[PDB]
Each structure stands twice: as C-alpha cells, then as structure tokens.
Amino acid sequence: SEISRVYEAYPEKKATLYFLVLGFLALIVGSLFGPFQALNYGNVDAYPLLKRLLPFVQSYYQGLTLHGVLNAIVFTQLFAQAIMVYLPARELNMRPNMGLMWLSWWMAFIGLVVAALPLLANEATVLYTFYPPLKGHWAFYLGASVFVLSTWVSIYIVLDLWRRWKAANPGKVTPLVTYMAVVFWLMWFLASLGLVLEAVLFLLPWSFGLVEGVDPLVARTLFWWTGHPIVYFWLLPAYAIIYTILPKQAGGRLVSDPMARLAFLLFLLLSTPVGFHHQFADPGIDPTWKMIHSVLTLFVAVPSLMTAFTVAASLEFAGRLRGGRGLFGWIRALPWDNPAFVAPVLGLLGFIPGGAGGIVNASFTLDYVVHNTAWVPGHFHLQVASLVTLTAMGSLYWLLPNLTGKPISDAQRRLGLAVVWLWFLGMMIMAVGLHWAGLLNVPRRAYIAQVPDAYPHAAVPMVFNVLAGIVLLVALLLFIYGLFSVLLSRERKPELAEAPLPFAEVISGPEDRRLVLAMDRIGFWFAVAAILVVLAYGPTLVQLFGHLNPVPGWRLW
C-alpha cells in the first residue's frame, strides 16, 4: 500500500510528515490573529477589518483564545511529536512501534477537531488558560483533554524503542539523541499528571453537568503543575535540534555529548516542581511553598545558562574551522545563507532578553511588578513565538526534504530566510513594545484598542507594536506563501529524502563515560524526579484537596 520505497522501508517517515504538517497548519490559523493583536497594543483597532474578513469571529478574545490554544498548545506539541519521536528512531535506526505512533496522529486530530468546533463557535472562549470559573463547552475540555493524552502514547513508543535498543545492544550506554528524547518524554509524564488530574478529577465532569462548580484555587494549582514543565516540553525538542543538528549545520560539532546529556538530565529533575511561580499572585498557597518554588525556578535556569555556553563555544569552533577571524570573526564566518542555520541562531539571539526577563519573572517578589502585564506576553514571544517557533520554522529547510524529497530551490531558500529575518525582526520590536508597555502597566489579554485613552503613557511603545504587527503580518504571509511551496511543488527527488539526518559528530573526551555513565541510570533519576514533584506539590494538593470549596461557572460573553 505505498511507492516511494522511502516509506515502505520507513513509514514513520510519514507518522512524522503528518504530525508535522497538522502542526504548521495549526500555526498558520493562529499566527494570523497575531498581527491583529499586535495592533491592538499599538492602540489601533483593526478588529473590524478582521471581524468581516472571518465574520465567524465575534470578540477580540475569540481570537486570543484561538491564538493561544492552536499556537502554544497545538503547533508546539505537534512539533514535539515530529522531532522528540522520529529523532530517537533514526539514531537507533529502529522502526518506532508504528501502530501506537499512529493512534497518536489520529488521536491528536479528533481531540483537535473536538475542541475546534466549540472554539470556532464561542462556546469555549475562555483564553488558552481555560481558567475556572469561566466555563467552556463540553467539547472543549474533551478535545483539548484528548489532544494532550496523545503524547502519552508517544511516551510508550519512545520508552518502547528505548528498551528494544537497551537490550539489542546490552551494556552500550544510550545514544545521545534518544537520551534526550528519553528523559524529555519521561519528564512529560511526571508533569502532565497535573492537567490530567484537573481534567479527569475536575474540568470534565463539571464540563458534563456532573457537578455544579469548580474550586479554582486547585483547578489552577493543578493546571500550573502541567503549566510550567509543558513549555520545557515546547522547548527541549528544539534544544535537541540546536544541540545535535545546528552544530553540523554550522560546520562544527557538538563539543560535549556530556554537557548536553547533563542539561537534559537537569531539565527532567527540575521542570516539574516550579509551578507556584505562576501562582505568586494567587492566594491560599503559602509564602514558603511559594519561596520553595522561586529557588527551584532559578535552578531550572541552570540548564539554559549552560545550553548557552555549550552552543556558543559550539557555533564558534565551527565558525573558526571555516576561517574564523578575531573576537567576532567567528560570527561573520557562519552559513548565514541557509535558513536551517539562521532561524534558530536568530532564535537563540533574542533568547537573551528572553531568559533575563524570565529570571525577573521568577524572582518571587519581582513578579508583582510584571505579572499579568504586557511584560509576560513579551517575555514568551522571545521564548516560544520565537526561539522554539523559528527553530521549528527553520527546521523545515532540512527536515522537510528528508521527509518528502522536494529539495529546496534557490527560490525557496532565499525565501526561507527572508521569512525568518522578518519574524525575528518582528518579534524583537514586538518584544520591545510589549516589555515596555507592561512596565507602564498595560494589562495583558486586553482589547485596549477599545478603551483607547486608558493607557496614555504607553504612547511610543504603542508605536513599536503597530510597527510589529505590520512586519509580522508580511512575515506571516511570506511564511504561508513559502511553507505552501515546499509541501506543494511536485518535484520528488527521493535520494536526499533518504539523506540521513544531519546529526553532528560529538567532540569526545575522557571524562565522558564516568559522568555520562552517571546520568544513564535513567531510572534512579526518573524517581529522584517523582520525589521532587511530590515533596513540593505534596504539602499543598492536600491543605487543598481538603478544603474543596467549588463555586459555580459563568459565561461573560
């Protein structure tokens, strides 16, 4: 039942094509509403140009609610499901349990169409957060709560390949890329619990008439348990793309399989127990369980500060190798002509004001200055909208040939990287207006266009967002124009559709296999883990599951 021998000899080279392509569609839809939201905070009311251009659309918020779910949840997880599976495969060469890796895609779909329907209705128009008490449709919390479950299959399929290989190669350590996708997948179970908890034990029954109210202290304490780790989910796959594929896109080598393995280890141990950072402004949770997360939260920053050095040092070896002049001659040396390289490097760039703001955000009390203002959507745009997004957007310009075969025409390439340079330029500016507006107090999630003298001290940054919206608009269209040509051209040159995946070599030393051999007791950690999730959310999910005070839902739209 196939042709391209390519898929008859690897069919997950398709269980990866679709997951991926459901993913960028989901991006195209969302990232549409974005240029319009930019102009909002630019103080400019373009929502009627919108309202009639898709009159299915009611409120500004019907949008943000689309913009949120589809981009932060749909596009990202779907990308985590192309890369964080198909990579562990090709590195072990083994065929993922192709059935389970296909109940995954079909699942995803219906979950997505289940929660799309009400969403394009107005029956769940309750922001990406779906915070209780505002109630949504019944079809929302199923869809969403189906979609998320998809990944669980995936955890298996990977854990599955992981042990067929452990045993068909006994005593050889785990390979590098699988070792990522293992602790990464194992980190996602121990997170997801939270929101699966709050779906099983809360949103669903009460979404189904099966009680008349949700307590929100826990419905939103349980939601951040998933609510943090998830981004790390959003993120670690392109750390993988960046750790093990950027180097050699650069003409370098990862310079430590160890330091990368340690990152991903530390991410497993620390991305799950940090949720109260989200809850500084929530009451009912104690100052110390608060403070206990603020330091854990500054800890998880130790993986990203490290990933920085390892990657810089790594771009640089590569940079010199290729003629690398003086103190910054290394920069001017790199493949600046190949978007598989440019997309994530621009990403990583503004990932600097990214994490910095993060470290503000998490410094317990400082959060009161910025929490729920333009500051936050400015912070995450640097992170997801941009590093994550451009790292995936840019990962087409090599992972797409390798999954279809249409290579990239010097038309496409040179488009590949204008798209990339506007998105990054767009995101920077937007970033400046957002962070600044927030510092002035423009709240977020607010159709400020329509209370249009409320924020008058945010004049000049409002200009930056205008500027931003136009630029990202062009950028997004330019993007659509160009994704569409590389899964549409009917070229089909299948040989580089079997080019194996541009993995780097791995500048190897002596003080590897001691340390490397330390972080490979996957097990001992996957539990040192649990002990941490429990110690921290333990005490509260109890002073809390004991004072279950639920209240009735509402519907203010």
Binding site: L305, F309, A312, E316, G355, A356, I359, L366, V370
Partner: protein
C-alpha cells in the same frame, strides 16, 4: 587551541542582560512600596 573567547563573549552579554533586566526591575519593585 585556547580560550573560547567568543563563547565567553556570548555568555558575557547574556550576563549583562540577565542583570540590567533583574536589576532595573528590583528598582521598579522598590519604587513601589
């Protein structure tokens, strides 16, 4: 061959950023008692 001066400079920038950022917002938070 030596010092990865480049990567040192890259992580030098993240450091001024991760500071000017933290540090100004500390000012802002103290201006606001």
């Amino acid at each position: 061959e030596e010092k990865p001066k480049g990567a040192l400079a890259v992580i030098l920038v993240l450091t001024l950023t991760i500071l000017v950022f933290w540090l100004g917002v500390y000012a802002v938070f103290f201006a606001r008692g």
